Write a structure and sequence with these properties.
InterPro entries (chains A, B): Hemopexin-like_dom_sf, Hemopexin-like_repeat
Pfam family, one (chains A, B): Hemopexin
Number of strands of chain A: 17
CATH class of chain A: Mainly Beta
Shape of chain A: globular
Protein name (chains A, B): Lectin
Keywords (chains A, B): Calcium, Metal-binding
Number of helices of chain A: 5
Order of helices and strands of chain A: EEEEHHEEEEHEEEEEHEEEEH
Number of domains of chain A: 1
Radius of gyration of chain A: 16 Å
Structural class of chain A: mainly beta
CATH superfamily of chain A: Hemopexin-like domain
Oligomer: homodimer
GO molecular function, one term (chains A, B): metal ion binding
CATH architecture of chain A: 4 Propeller
Bound molecules: magnesium ion
Chain lengths: ~220, ~220
Amino acid sequence: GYINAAFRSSRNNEAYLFINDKYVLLDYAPGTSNDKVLYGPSFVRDGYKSLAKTIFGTYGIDCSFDTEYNEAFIFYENFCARIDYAPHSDKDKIISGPKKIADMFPFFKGTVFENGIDAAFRSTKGKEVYLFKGDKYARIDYLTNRLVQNIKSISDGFPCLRGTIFEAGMDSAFASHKTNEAYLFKGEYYARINFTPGSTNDIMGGVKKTLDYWPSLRGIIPLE
Amino acid sequence: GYINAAFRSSRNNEAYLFINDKYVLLDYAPGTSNDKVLYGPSFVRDGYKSLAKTIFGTYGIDCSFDTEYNEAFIFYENFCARIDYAPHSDKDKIISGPKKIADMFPFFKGTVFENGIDAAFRSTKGKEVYLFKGDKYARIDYLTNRLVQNIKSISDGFPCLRGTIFEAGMDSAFASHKTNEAYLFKGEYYARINFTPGSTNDIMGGVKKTLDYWPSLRGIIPLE
Ligand SMILES: [Mg+2]
Ligand SMILES: [Mg+2]
């Protein structure tokens, strides 16, 4: 019962985390340890009315990423959708979907990503997004719907992850408001990283226990 | 693009059939020539406002069956839902779901129905329903949620189909208003049969070209 998906909000220093069929709105305070729950833990179906009579409302979200504006892609196994999350408001809507990952992102056809994606996060470069499944990762442009480069092993693109738990996969992720920094999650552990679009660079440097640094999540994970 | 699902309507001699992501309402006039179309072909997402933003609105219904009153279960791959189709009106709604077949019908877990059901039809006996997948068939009770008997080959429970093309599978089916008669479909063919609960019987003779006997379906199937 750990974090399965997330995406950073348009509101500064804010992110949405998904656990089982629920979610929380956090002030994650990247340059601090005083992160706090702004909303939730709440059922996706209650907080997101537009998702209530859909599989996402029933089972939750297992992968996601923010695009731009108040929009983001959400996934649940084979299926995905593009929604307006309408932060600190009540007007969430579905824009595209629910449809299979293969119809939303054709280029994923025949790939390991077709039946589900483990995690993803918004890049700083153009409309680029990094996505992960197993020990593999993809780099796409969601605006033009293109695979920017070949699918590679995670370590090919993020070398600093070699030897760590993130080497073989990642349960969840989201991009920070601090430029070129992102957060990864797996088991009871998490990482904060500084990535470089198109380049191979390696930091940051303390795979940390999640609850020791995120106090706003005490009693929210594990959720079983 | 042939019929992939159907269910009997509470309204006399009326049945809904699903083709691709569309559907048609029909007076199928069992023992008469005035076999005609009442509504559609129309997109599911259009005819059913309650399904506009669901996977069913996107891909259609691949299997279903009426239960009691104005309700029916509809499926799409491993997912399903119980809806109130509100015959001849605007007021349709999702009653339960959508959830996985495994979660709506726990007894299907581990069986070949878990990830999808080909077709089904309501029995006249109690709250029982027959469902088909491949060359196997199931007999269940949807109120008490149980398999009434071990799943077995279609020919074992429906001997009259041995030899016929339905021996190995059914694209679709629905029960007739005339007692113990059901309609089965596969490709350009169909068959009207007389079944008897708790027994193994023939019959009704004549696997026929569907368009040959359903004047109202010309122009509708095959849907291309
Ligand atoms: Mg995940
Ligand atoms: Mg079917």
